[model samples]
Structure formats: C-alpha cells, structure tokens
Target chain A: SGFRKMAFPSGKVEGCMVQVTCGTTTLNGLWLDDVVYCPRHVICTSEDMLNPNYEDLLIRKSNHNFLVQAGNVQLRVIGHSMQNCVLKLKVDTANPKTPKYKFVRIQPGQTFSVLACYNGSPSGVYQCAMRPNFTIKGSFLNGSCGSVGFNIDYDCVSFCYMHHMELPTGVHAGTDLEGNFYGPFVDRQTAQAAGTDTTITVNVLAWLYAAVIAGDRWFLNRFTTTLNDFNLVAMKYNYEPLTQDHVDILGPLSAQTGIAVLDMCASLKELLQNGMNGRTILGSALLEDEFTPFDVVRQCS
Target chain B: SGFRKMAFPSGKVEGCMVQVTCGTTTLNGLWLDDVVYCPRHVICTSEDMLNPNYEDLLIRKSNHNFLVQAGNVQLRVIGHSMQNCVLKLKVDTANPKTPKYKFVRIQPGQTFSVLACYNGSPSGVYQCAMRPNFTIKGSFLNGSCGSVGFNIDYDCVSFCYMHHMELPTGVHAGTDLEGNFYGPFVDRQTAQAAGTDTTITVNVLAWLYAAVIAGDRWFLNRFTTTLNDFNLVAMKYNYEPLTQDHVDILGPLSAQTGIAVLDMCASLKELLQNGMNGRTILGSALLEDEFTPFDVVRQCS
Candidate 1:
C-alpha cells in the first residue's frame, strides 16, 4: 500500500477551487455555478443522486400488478369484473439503470389490456377482477422489458405471476432478480455442450439464488467481494467477465438470504473441469434441496 | 475508530527490546532466556505447536480396523466376515484444534472396537477390514469425543458412513462437518417443542450442507462470516452462543455442502414470532422441492 502525500484547495461556496498533489502530479477542480467540475471531467451538480421511485417501492405482498414502462410507454395494470378489489404487483426492469421500476396496486378489471409497450412490445403484469387477486404475468423477448402473464387467488390475497417465455421442451430456464432469462439445457449432454459464457451465467445464477436463500443482507454485502474470487475461478476454467447486471443482483442477496449456493459453485467447477453437465447438475442440485423446480421456474420465468 | 497511536523500540536482534504506548500507559516486553516474556505473561518456548500424531494421519480408503488405546481403555472395530483386508478411515474430529485427529488404516477383525477416547470417554470410528476403501467417520458427546458407528457397502469404492448414534424410532438425526449431531426430531411435534438453540443448530447445519454442495472454497471462505450472522439471529430468537466446538465445525462446510438449510432458517424465524412443527415446515418444504428426506439424512450424517 502506497501512502502518498496530497493537498486539497481552500474554497468558499460561491467561488472556490480544490487541488490535489500526488508526487509530481497535481490535479485541480473548480466549484462554480453550483457544480464541482474537475479538470478531468469528473463533475457533480448539487443534487442528491437518489432514485425518485424509492418513495413508492413496497416489498410487501398485495393483490395488484405494478406496471413499469420505459421510453414513450405508459404501463398500468387493468382490473376486470364487477366486484371492486385491490391488486399489487412488482415489475423487474432487468436493467440496472432502472432496477426497481414499479411496485403498485391495480383495481379490478379497470383499464386497457395493452397497458404499455417497451420498444413496441407489451409489458407489465395484468390482474383480472374475475379472479379477485389473479395476475396475468407477461414474458418479453430475449432481453429488455416485455410481457408475461399473471393470476390471483381467492379473497384478493396473494397474486402469482410468470415472467419468462416458454423455454424449449426438455430445456430448463433460470431468471435473474430483474427478470432476465438464461438456459433451456436439453440435459447434461446439452449442458456440457453449452459455451463458457453461458455456463458462467448459469453457475452465477445458481450461486446467486443459493446466497440469497442462505446469507441475507449482511452476509451478501460481504458476498459481493467474493464475486471477484468467482471471477478468478471462472477465468481459471476460462470465461469472460460475468455481466455487470448480474453482479448488480448481489445487492438484493445482501437484503434477502443460503448454503446450497456454495455447493453449486464447487460442483459446477468440478464438472467444468472434469467434463460438464452444467444445467442438469445445477437443476438437479436445486431440486435435491429445499429449492423446488417451481422456484427456478418462477425465477427463470 | 478509537485507534490510539503507538510506537515500538528497535535494536539488534541479539539484545533488542520492544515497548508500546497507549495513552498514559506504557507496556514493555523483554527477550528473556530465548523467549519473549511480556508483562502480561505471554510466554512461549521456541517450538512449533504441532500435534504429535500428525504424520501418521493418512486420508485414504481401506478395509481395516486400527485400535487406539488410552490407559485401560480399548477401542476396536468388529469385522463380521472371515475375509482379511486392510481398512482406511477419516475421523472428522469436530474440533478445529484437532481437525484430522487420526486418518489411518485398521486391520481385519480388529480389537474390542471402542477405537479411541476423548476426555476419558470412548470416541472415534473404526473401519473394519472386511471392506476396502471404507472410512470411519466419527460423532461426539457434547463435551467429549464419542463413539459413532461405521458402515461400508459394495466394492468399497466409495463409502457412505453415518456418524450419529442410534436415533430413536420415528426420530431423525443429522450430522455436520465436524460430525456434531443435530437432530432426532421425533417427527414435527418434537422439532417444534425443541429449544431455540437446538432448532438454530439444526437449521444452521442444514444450510451449512446446502452451501457446501453449491459453492466452492472461494465462496465458502466468505461464507464463514455468515455464521456470525447465524449466531446473531439465534441470539435474537433467544438462544445462547451455540457450542463453540459446533461453530468450529463450519470449516467442513467449505469442504462439503444443500437447499433445505434456507427453509429451516426462515421457518424457524417465523415460528419464533408466530408462536410455532418446525420440522413439519422443514419436511414439507423439502417435499415441495425436489429434495427427499434421504437427502437431508445423507448430508446430516
């Protein structure tokens, strides 16, 4: 660790400047017009860098579908039936720039069926009033926000929704926290035939779910650093850096919380080196423990 | 943040002395008779703290019983068949102070089978020479190293050994990395009636197994911190610090691993709050998923 000497400039709110010195190099910044503009273009306006949606995002369960749209689209849940009922839903944008897009409630059979569109495709979960609390989850294309179907049960209680498209027969799928899909392995043979990037992603999701169920927020906070270790191991087995969006999911694990995560990573490594069967092994391991196929289906969906 | 500054003295190694200062108090130590003698009685002879029985420990598969005796006590493995064969065993001493106590090969139709002793009590596992490539996994009394049975099957290629004592009828038992016993939950009713400490341990071990199976060492190393978290949650639920020896057993989680771990934790927390069949929930969660009782049993054992 190098402890270099440095300097900072004296400043006043209205007209001020700051400077730093590191050996032979000196850097400077100016505080002008309510913005701090550094010589190297590191500028910051006097504004809080917080998401405006944080005020409305509630994680509790309710009987409504929360619609979130991007660009020119306006997403909203439509309720059906004569009986007035409340609905709740969550929309995972899959994009870090807009991770938690929506957490809202919809009235019974109330609005347009085509709630909103992302680049010309329908998006958001729809709750029909006939079922009181049912949601029609939507499935999008391979990426970006799209559509999926949803359903609700009796008494306006809990709502269940599906997010991923129908995977190929014999192929299993897994989804990220933001609702991005991966996989459809035919079997162990297909898993072995899958490419390095695909394998790393599959394995990453497997461990992600494991950590979420086992560790919770505090543990996951430390867990984020371990991804560096995972990257090292993945490179040892040969693969590119995992997607940043996927790594971003760790933020949720620190908040939620398991052990099966470690096993998936280890088992995958062993299989990766000794030959491979990535998905079946992962799928089988998840199934072998408290995690159900439905859990994967829900996540992958 | 209360890191008081300190200074150290320096000189030739032959006659050098050292001292420290924290506030008004000054501490000093001297090199006396080849050992560093601090005022606080921190003393150590110039020698490595190594276990005497280290070299003899061999982790391999065999079919023999090795008798380890202490005073008048004798420990042995009984061989059922007349076939003479060599035996190999790996005793998971649930003590980090002695991780691999004795990994060796025993002989055919060995002695009285008591095997070994920990704190004057009979302990350790014996591998009978009737089967080749078999291991003697061990279990322990809460305080002492204790006796646990050993089993071998087929060609002795891979041995699956149970480390728990005879569990009662309708009661199930689980073992952790250090071979510490967890359950014997007399169905679900008994699991609920169990104290917070027992339930926490049960759930902890469950997740330990899960993590071991899913994540690798790089992951498990980070996972070690989660135990601190587990302890915190257990305490919040009104439990004492789980046995130190048991917490030490997590070393194995990095070595071995499952998903039921999560359900048990979540279910137990819910029960503590809602006025709680802990196992009914755990068992049901397993059933709902792909894992069977056999899976938990295998990991626990």
Candidate 2:
C-alpha cells in the first residue's frame, strides 16, 4: 500500500522562521496496529472512548448506530441529555484541501473509533476534534481602577493581590498588595494600572469588594470557556437557600452570566434527569445504520 | 429563536432555481423531522432509524452509495471504476423541477457512503437514482427503448451502452436501442440534432462519458430527469451476474448481468432465510447490546 511508504509532515519553529516538510520515513510505522499505538490518552471511566486519529468509519442502514463497537473506540455518556445530539462524520478521503469528516453535538463521555479491517487502503492519518459547549469568565472587578486599584507598598495581603491582579490587561481593577484602590474610571483606556497609588479609605472599600468579586471571578474566569463554563462553576459554588448576605451578593451576578447558562441548565437538568422521556429532542445526531449480518452470503478473497 | 419564524432565503434549492419559503414553524418543528412535508413534493430522512419521522427515506446511502429507498424518489449508483464511482443524489430540491436522485458505482461492491445528520437546514426535495460504473463509451444506448424513445416498454430491459468504439478520428460512432453501433457519423455541428430521422437518438452517451473523462460529470444524461426515461437503468439489474450457460448464449451482456446479479445475491438470500438464532447466513445484523439498569444520580444533578 502507498501508506507503507507514506511519511508524516514535519516542521520546526525558530525565533523568526518556521520550516515545514514531509520526511521519506513514515513517522508512525508499517501497519495500523503499529500506527494506532493504543492512544496515550486514558479512556474515561464514564465513557467508552475512541482515540482521535484520521481514519475512516462506516455503518449500515438497519443497524442502530448507538453503542457501535469499532476496534477500541467506544462512546458512553454520564447523563441522558446527550442522547439526541447528532454526530456527523465525513471521511477526509486523505485530501487535505477538502474536509474529511464532520459531526454535531457529540455529547460528553461518549466516544467512537474505527474498525481495523483493511481492503486496499491502509490506515493513513486520522484526526478528530470535538466541540463541547464550555466557557469561563468571572469578572475580577466591579467598576474602574479608581475604586479597585491597589497601593504597591503594603506587603502582606496586598502583596498577593498585586500579584494576582497583574495580567496582560494590566493590574485588574481590584485591591493590590497594599490593599489599595484601583478602578471606577470613566474610560477603560484611562484606568490606572500596576504601581498606582491610592489613599486609605478608597483602599478599604476596594479590598472588601475585591475579596468577594475577585475570588469568585478568579474561580469562574479560570474555569469557564463559555456560558456552559459559567453554569458548571455556579453549580459548584451556589448552595441552596442562600443566607441574607449570600443572596445579596450572589443574586445579581447569577442573573447576568450569559443566557446560554440558563438554556443549558434546562437541557442539562432534562437530559441528566430524564432520558428525553416524552419530550421531543434531536435524534440521528450520531448516525443511522443498517447492517444485515445474515446478508453476508459470500465474501471475496 | 428567529429560526422558528417562517423565512424565505432558506427556501433556496441546492442549485440556483425557485425559492422555497418557510413560515411560523419553529426551527425544531422544521428541520428536526425526516418527513417534513412542504407546499409541493418535499421529503427528508436522516437514515437514522431512531428519528420520529424515520419513514420518509429519500436517497439512502447504499451498501454502495445512491440507493434510493423510495420509488417516487429513487437513488441509483453511477460512475465507472471503483475510483471513478460517483454516487449521484439527485434531489427535486425545487418546485416543478421533477425532483429525482441518481447514485453511481462500479461492478464490484468496493464502495461506501458518507453519513451526515441534518437537523437545522430547510427541508430539501429528494429522490434516488444510480449509475454503477464509469463506462469508456462516449455515448449510451437505452435498453428499455424499442426504437420508441421515452416510452417505457415493461418487457424491455432498458440500459445504456458505452458508445465511441475505436474508429478513424473523423468517424464518430453512436448507438441505437438494441445497443451500441458504430458510424462514419457526423459530429454535432454537422448533425445539429434537428428533424433528421422522425426520431433522433440523443448523443447523451458522448456527453456523459466526456464528463467522466474530464471528471466534471456528476449527473447522468441530463435529458430525462428520471433514469427510466433515458438509457440509464438500475445497476442492480443491468449488472446481474449470469450463470455459465447464460454467459455463453448472451456473450458480453452476460458479463454485465452476472455482476449485477451477484451484487444482489446476498440481500436476496438473507431475505429468504432470515432467522433469529444468528446461525442462519442472513440473520439480523444487530448483536444484542449489553443492557444495564438505569441508575439515578440526584446528588450529581
């Protein structure tokens, strides 16, 4: 097969330039077993998994596409919400200029792989990527630097604040190492950045609000990739029947976390709680198959 | 959720033709079902057995490609060799266009279909037809036509034969209803498809073959929207595998019939001997999936 002689593309990036080329020697090896290498990634316990690669897969019409077994690949789910999510697959046919495969709404915890059988085409390169709805971004500050900026001098608690607030966006509008005041600025461009100085009173308010906002913001910001991200975080932090102070603080932020969070919440709750039971949900999201085993009267050698 | 509102642009056909307008129906109510009924004739199927509207099958990807599940919308195989096999999915995606689909393939069963899920696009009119292989003939002779064109003679076995056999450069050979015949023929410029013989044979063979050679041809002879109208016949019929004695009497025709017959043998055998034991040659393809009791995880929810 041509694959036995096929090679992988190689390149190296230097400080200013990059070189890309394919080597005469195939990087993986001679056969599929040699090529598959039993994926380095561990399979999720909650899901049967398919190692992502660039391989072609197929199923027949009458067969149920659910829980298909292709070599080591498998797909499972933690919750029922993913049942109707479709997975569209288009084999690349090894043509780089054209798309090889496509899928939609592949739920978390499910995995699919391919058969090891070969007719003529030996396995070449197979690559797959998934897009799960996930996000993160807890606001690290409320207003402008005028209210949140920190003083550089205070070393103990303020020192840690200074370190945390400093980022590519500048000293985040929050208390600093000296527990100083930062933002409440009229415009973002004019906001005071690192090394800004603030008096005692402003610093006190900044530090107080910053503690509540920054901690939550830091957690959410670190975790969320999108609205789905925010929901996941909120679910983790928000306890039932919030205390008066808790309700006073968390209520406003919860309402503003993108609409996606609310929508996903219903979906998550529905799927996880019910198997789409009576509700009409998307189907054929994975595949529809028809495989007639007894239809196999003969085989070619 | 404007997707739920009836819209216009979404009504566009796969080709540049009439526009289809959708109204009031929500996105889910429109794109989710395979059997979406439209103003005129429009049907869709996800090839997914699990869908709510699994009954509306248009062109199903065959054991090869372009297998039409419905007669009003049939899909046949097309193309030449294994590599050139082109499965045409002819959709009547527009109104009053005589919607149809055609699938193509080669003699052997070395083919597969690309699977995709649709849940968010406007309903497209669909049908199925097929061409099994890439013929070397530049033109084709319709087997179903008995000197009378477009008129279906049931007893007649309609088919297309590859024309343009070896001849002097100036000699253009075409075909007839009986099959292909050579000619010291005039090119189109000379024979300008006018009122020649009360009935003139269409040189669709020449055009279809040219498309195959130039690699631009995807549809069959563009004359009749239906395969039965023109020379194209089902690969499942024309390429039937003939037995030895049949081959001797039929000659080259036997070779074509032999292949087609073999292509369908297994399916026929299974249909006849379907059994539940899994011991039969044609038992259902689905192996029983492991069943586990559903467990509720309210805490996780």
Candidate 3:
C-alpha cells in the first residue's frame, strides 16, 4: 500500500487523473464481476465485461475502498498490452486550478453503459440510469483522447454514478464533486431529503443545498467526503419509505411510503387514482428510510 | 450557529466537561425521546426524561451530530434554575494534559444508569450493556463539583457511550474520542466487522484493533469520532443473521449467521448444540454487516 498510499486521494486530482505510471500492486485489482477495483490505480484490459481496452475512473477515499457489486461491474481500463493507449473519464468538473474552474470535453468513440440493482432484501428500492462517471484520466496518451466505449447503463458510477450514486452533482461529480455529501443544511435535512422523492432524494437535496450555499466546506472534511458520496447515493437509491409526507417514516424493522404528507392530498389522491406515476410524485421526493432493511443498512449516511 | 460555532471541538476536553455558563440558544434544545439533543449545549431540569437539573455530555463533531433513538435517551445536564450550581460528570479518564494524559474523579451524588435497545431493524444484532458515558463536565462550580443524578437503565451516552454506543474507548471516549470513525482498518474490514458476533461486534473489534494500533488517529478524523461511536454500538446491537463464521455475512441482505466461517466446525456446531454461548465464540468474533437494516441504516458508520 504505497504508490504514495496506493493512489487514492483525489479531492479533485484533475478529474481523478491516471496520467500514467500506474501498473502496480503486482497487477490485478480490476477483475470486475461487479467491479470493486481499487487504488492499485487501475489497470485491467479484459476479464471481458463485453470486451475492452479501457475503463479509467477515479473517485478516491484512499486506504483503498473498492466495492460495487449488485452484479455487472466491469472495468477494462486498458490492457491487450496497451495499444499505445486509449481511455479517459472526466465529466463536468471543478478545481482545474480554480480560476473559476468548470469543465467538459472528450475526444473519443463513447460507449458508457450500466444496468444496476436492489429491489429486495430490506430494500432501498433501486433503479436508475442516464448520465454519470467522473474524475477522469488514464492513458496510453496518444496525444490525449480517442478509443472510448464504456457501458453499464443501470448501476452506474463511471460505468455510471456508482457505489449507489444518484446523478446530479453535475451528472456525477462534475467540478470533480467536492464536499457536503448532505449534512449541514436542514429543513429536517431537505424535508428528510424531499421525503424520498427521487433523483435520489432530489439529487441529494439538490447537491446538498449546493453543499450548504456552495458545496465544499474546505472543512467538515469536504462534508465528510461528500457524506461518503451520499452513502453511495443512499446505497444506490434503496427506497424504503412507508409514510413520510404526513410523516411516520417509521423504523427499527420496517414500514411506510409511496407518500403520506399529512394526507398528501389523500396520498397523491390514492397513488394517482391507482395508476401511480407523476414520476411516482417527484419519485416519492427521494423516498426516505431506516426502520431497518434498505437491503440491510446504510442509513443513507 | 455561531457561539464559536455553537462550541464543540473537544478532542479530549477533560473527559468531556460541561463547565456551567452553557445555557444559551435562548433555551429548550433538550426535550428527549430516544434523544436527538444538540450544541445549544445544555440546561434543562424538566420536560423530564425522569427529571433532573444536569447532563453535560461533550462529544463534538460540531455542526453537531446527535441521534440515539432506540428508546430512553435522557440528559438533565442541569437546570431547576441552578443553586449557585451543581451537575458534574467525569469518569475513567485521559488528557489531564497528556504527560501521558489520564483521569478519574467526580464530586457529587451519583446516579448514572442505562438499559439500551435494538433486537430488530435490519439488525446489527443487539444485547450487551454495562459500561459507558464519558466526555464529562457540566459545572455548577462550588469551586467545581456536585448535585449529580442521571439514569436511563439502557441506552446511554452521558445518560451513558451513546449515539448508539457499545462502550470502551475506556468507556465512552476518555481522551475525548477523536478521529478515524472506522474507515481505516481491514481483514475484509476485520471479517466484514467480525461477522455478527457480539459486545456489539467484541467492543467494536476490541476498540477497532485499539484503533488500528492506538485508539486515535490524530487523523482519519479520530477514526471518524470512534466510527460514530461504532454506529452507537451497531444501532444498539440489532442482530440479523442465520449464518456467518466462514463467510456469507450477506445483505442488500436478509440471510446468514448465529456463525458460518466457511466451515467453522458446523457453524460453532449449530451454535453450541442449539444453546448458543462461549460469550458466542468471542461474540461471533464481533458481528459484520451492510445489506442494510441494522435498525434502519447506519452501516455501523
């Protein structure tokens, strides 16, 4: 554990750079069944998740924290003997030496996808897709960009906003996402994060009230590493509310939801007259939980 | 939220002092019901959780982080209007000024009790209550001591080691429980956290392997405040397992353990011939988790 502490510290290392030199830990931290890869600083080309010569993602917590498993976590960050190189991930972004930093740009073929899971075993509920993956950089540096084709579609972090993420931190930590993962802003914490109304509690109370008026404390230790990336987006949007709007978001063992709000106008007029879906009422407001079993326990931080 | 940031940065405030003069926030931040008190500091006496004029706990993550909620979380930290003063709480000890820093002493009418809860809710699996409450000092100052009386009979943290504590960091943070709230240790993180064994996962892996070789990082932010005091001792030991000993502590979860170790001689031999005890084989080696539920999510930090 020492490519300077197995390479994991990116509070925003230029959208998690893999500027090259990483092929250590004797090589093999990226086998990928549900890709719990690592701070071995990534280097895998094929254990075949639909074949690849690429998959360079960088989130960084250090002491090496890799675990995504719901199934299909593939990462081919680059191997077939590195055809001189090809792989990059940098979406939205921040702190490019903060001269009012912000970002975007890719010079590749593009093929990022995911499917994701979590519907049973205590249940946070789960299911989401469309845009994610950030803190990028990894190279066979052929002048900087080209052979890209990542995919997962459903359970994304890079392969889509993962570790159970819910997008909107600019679709996955743009400005390389820093601070207030959701803990210093209250309206009972965005009405307990919009009482579970989705976009994973409205993009986690809309990027935790923009990290309490400007996401990034420079201290709450970057809102405790973005509240562990909002507990991997509430353990991958595990949805467990029984009744929150009228309030009874119960717990210790199970109960409530779909909506309650002191009679949420007769509970969304009885779940949209029994057909349920004004986007499930803004996605139940992100869905609220903790009477135990959001698929076992992550109290969304 | 500013009286020097509502006062709380105690990485060892003489056990955890309350030294009077704390009665600001214009009053009433301690009503108590499984207690979610605050940094307005303290000064009640009644609206009573079994009544008193004292209870000055001093754990500090400041912007405050309070929540115990199994049942019975009281704190009188002092009030009935102060008789020139009285309500001291100090125990075990550490940092009298680190010339090896250590402590012990009280000067009042004692009455600290606790019972504690959680046998349900996604179960971190519960049961074990005996020693806790630290970070003392609430002050009336007859020079500096007296008139004490706190009781809960179960569930403590200055009322008793709380916020769902298990006790030991020399019973509720002696040298003011600082840093590494458990994000550093590894053995799959001590068998997922001793695969559901017990003294709430063996005093949280014997005070997290004496906090990975010495209980306090001065850095991983005090092992993250003793891993949220080991997620209030795994949400007051809310058990959940049908198997776990040789691996398969399962979750997103619902299955595994009273023991399974990959073949621990027939999972302790079917948990000691159906009787289940050797203090449960060093308490299942200290129980593990995270498929969600240990009483509605805390991932024990």
Candidate 4:
C-alpha cells in the first residue's frame, strides 16, 4: 500500500493469454516472479500444466484483475513496480518488563522474510512478517537503500512502499516460507491440561502433546528453508501444508493415540492483542478498553 | 639394476592346473618377466579346473604357462608403462661452435611431459615421446613436488635443473624469436652448412621461444644442446639407413620437402642410434676419424 506502479500492456497483452512460469528451468527455485505470454487459446487449454508451470493463464476475473484484464490500453500503477518488493513483519509486544518498548521494530538493514501459506486452508497458511519503521527504511543493498521483492502467489514483486518509507515483512514462517518452527495443531482439553491424578506418572498426556508438536514442526521445517530452497532462492511450492482435518486430529490424537500437539491459540491471542493483527482480530470497537477481551475469544478455535 | 637388501621372488609363476580352496582374495598386477608351471596328471573334468562358484575365486591361464603369477610380475605392459618412463636424449659432439652441451642427464629433481600426438593417423595412442632426450618427470599434486603415483599417467609436467644459469637474450620482437631478422629459406641451407640452421630457424620461429630461452640460460642451453641432434631428431627411419634408395628419396625429399623428410629421417635415426641397441651407431674404426662423413651417413636401411 505504497507508491507501487505497474504498467499495463506489460508485454503480456495483444489479447494474448498470460503464462505464469515458476521454479528453475534446470534446477528447482532458480527464477522468480517472471511473467510470459501465451496465445489466448493456449491460456484456455483444458490440460493441466505440470512440474514448473504456475497456475494456467485465465484472464484474472477478480480483485486487481481489472487492470490486468483491460483491453488495448497502457496502465502504470502510481507506485513502485510490484515485482521484487519485500513485505517484512516484526513481533513487537513479546517482552513485558520493558514498558518503554511498545513494539519491537526489526532493526534497520536486515531483511525480514515474508512467509505465509497463500493456500486458503485453515491453519495451513501460516503468515510470518517483519514490522518496518523509522530505524529501518528498507532492506540494505550494498550498504544503501534497496527494495526487496515480495512473492505474490509464486511471483516476486516490489510494490513500492512510498520509496523511502519502511514496510512490514510478510508472515507465516512454518505456513508460507520454509522454516523450522511448526504448530497450529488441535489439542484435546485432557492433553492441554496435563493430568493431576497419578503420582510418578510418565505424564503421558503432556509428552504425547509435545511429541506431535515437535514431530510436526520437524516434518514441516524440513520443507521450509531446505538447503536447496535457501541456495536456489526461488519460490515454488515444494512443501505440503496440513489440511483442516490434520489440525483437527492433532488434539484428540494426542490424547487417543498418545502423540504430542502444539498450541498456537496463545500466540495468536497475544498477536491480536498487541502485535500486528491485534486490532483487526479484536475489532476497533474496543479501542478504549485495552485490557478487555473481545467477543472472538470464545471463537478462538 | 638397483640395489636391494635381500633377494625377493619374481611375481608370476606359469602353468599348473590348480583347484585352490577357501580364502578371501584380491587380484593384482603380476610383474614377473615370464611364468612357468607344469603338471603330469590329467584332470577329471575341465569345468572343475576352469570354473569356481565363489566370487573371489579366479582361475585363468597364467601367461607363458605360469601356474599362478604373483608378486610384482607384470602380465601386460598396460598403457605405455614401459615407454612412459624418464627419457634422456642428448646432442653432444654435433657442433663445435655451440660449446658442447649435455641435455640428457637425469637430474635429481626434474619434471616430464608426454608431448602427445594430438593429430595423426594413429591418433589415440600417444607416441612414447616426440623428441629424443626430451626428459619428463611429474608431480601429481598440482602445485607440489610430491612423489607421483607410479600407476597414474600424466599429460605434462614441469622439470627443474640444479643450476640457475641465465641464457643469452637473443632478440626482442613480436614476429619471431630472432627479432627483426628476415632471412630467406635458401639462406637456411647456408646456415646448415655453417651447422647453425637449427639455431637460426628456432630463433626465427617465435618470440616466446626466444624469451624462454633468453630468460633461462640453463634451459635454453640444455635445449639447444639437445637440438644439436638435428640429424636424428628430424628423421623418421634411421633403421633403414641411407641406402641408394634412401639417398635417392632424400635428395628429392630434401629439395621438395625442405624439412619434412629430414625431420622424419631424424626420428628414425634416433630410434636406430639409441633405441635398445645399447651402443653407438658408428663402428669403433670410424669413431676415430677426424672427418668421417661415412660414419654419420646411414647406409644400412
């Protein structure tokens, strides 16, 4: 939401269908966010594209589709080109002793990686971001200000953020970007509350919960930040995100099957309370009562 | 040929029908000069003597009837082993003005190269060496002078001489090693008469050669000393010495093929003179003559 500009007739028109190519031509994840053209007929092909091809070109029907789908006219977005721009996120309210520390802004010059699963599945698309503010204007490039790109879907673009103004990094490390952290599991009340009935008990319930969380995180992290992904430096889904059913099984299975599960509701609650989405998740109506809980607390599932 | 502390058995033993039993085993190169073995009784079945089911068991006829060739006995001279050893050719006593030089000494620390034949009818197999006395030694490690493995073949190697003598800087020019000199080909004949045709020609060939020679006197002097064996270096068939037929061909070839025929003849001369013959070409009678042209000329083709 800055001075991002994109020119229409971006060498993709001529009523020609748009072709989204992703990943490396030779190896995985070498190229990023490059758009090429295809004939209108091929764009409408019924065949499923495989391997390196991104979603087949259909005239984008909604959202910012108007600009892309328009006819025979030039367009220039009134900001920086969306390609190669970065979205950084930060966790500001993690510490409490330092009252002066309102929000933890990511330090200047360091690149905050945006990680979010674009796939619309409950708890599957985790979003990770960095908060951009005064201390850091933009990710440093060669000791100078430079724009980092954001991957919209599978393409990298720099939507100019008022040029000199700082921008937030993306989120969803486990969900979107490949990394080590994992959670977003459903835990049964029994597993969540650890048992008090047994003495010298193995605490089977808690261990089970921890096991699933650690295991899922381990499995999830393998796809995230794999040596290949980091070295190749391109965005193409080589990882799998759990479905809603998977999340649902996490809680009961920890109790029934004796597996471990991690809870993300706490982090989300803290995030909505003081982090980036605190207001949005909790609504603006409660602005006056900072300590009051929102109606959505009951809907925390 | 070399001193040893104790007597060691030669590698291979020829000719014996063996039915060896039970043990782990490995195959190795047999290095004996010849194999020898015998058995009086005939075997019940050829398969019994021929085939053994075990993976490690091997039964093959030993070369030259050796029962089981062992030790450092060689089965085959595999891949230029015999020919690739250090070579030492010299051009001593060829010319008086050049100041007798010896380029064939096997120095303490010297490198060698296989001046491989890249273009020829029998191209795949490299000739043992291109020039006589063109000694080569190798250091397997790229930048170190460690002992190279005997089993490895190399393309080229750098040699070092004990003395750090400087060579006479001949000329400074881009055209040839001789610099501004531009003498006619016929004049090469006059140079040959003066026994300095090679010096004139090589110097006139390339400035780089001149620089290398000039910068390193020992290298150039040694190189020149070797080149003085022009008669042998340039000929192809020294064995079929200059008979009436050879002389007839030589006259025409020398006139028509200026240096080509002579070069081949030199190669041949070298092969015959220093090959495995183990003696000088000219008999002891002619070796005493002051101007024994007949001794130098070939007649036993």
Q: Which portion of correct inter-chain contacts appears in model 2? A: 0.00
Please identify which of the two predictions, 3 or 4, would achieve the higher DockQ against the true structure.
Answer: 3
Model 3 ranges with Cα > 4 A deviation: A1-41, A44-169, A173-301, B1-88, B95-301
Residue A276 C-alpha lDDT in model 1: 23
Off by over 4 Å in 2: A1-25, A28-127, A130-261, A278-280, A285-301, B1-301
What is the TM-score of each predicted model, taking all chains together? Answer: 0.18, 0.17, 0.20, 0.13
Judge candidate 2 at residue B298 and give its lDDT. 8
Residue-level lDDT of model 4, residues A24-62, one tens digit each, is 111001011222111111122234222212222332322
lDDT of 1 by residue, A253-291 (tens): 323433333333453444445542223322222222222
TM-score of chain B of each: 0.22, 0.14, 0.22, 0.15
Write one digit per residue (lDDT tens) for candidate 1, span B122-153. 21212211111121111222222122222212
Instruction: Give the best candidate by lDDT.
Output: 1
lDDT of 3 at A5: 4
The DockQ-derived docking category for candidate 2 is incorrect
> Clashes in candidate 4: how many?
104
lDDT of 3 at B26: 22
Candidate number with the higher DockQ (2 or 4): 2
Query: What DockQ, between 0 and 1, does each candidate earn?
Result: 0.01, 0.01, 0.01, 0.00
Predicted structure with the largest TM-score when compared to the true one? 3
Better of 3 and 4 by lDDT: 3
True contacts kept of 4: 0.00
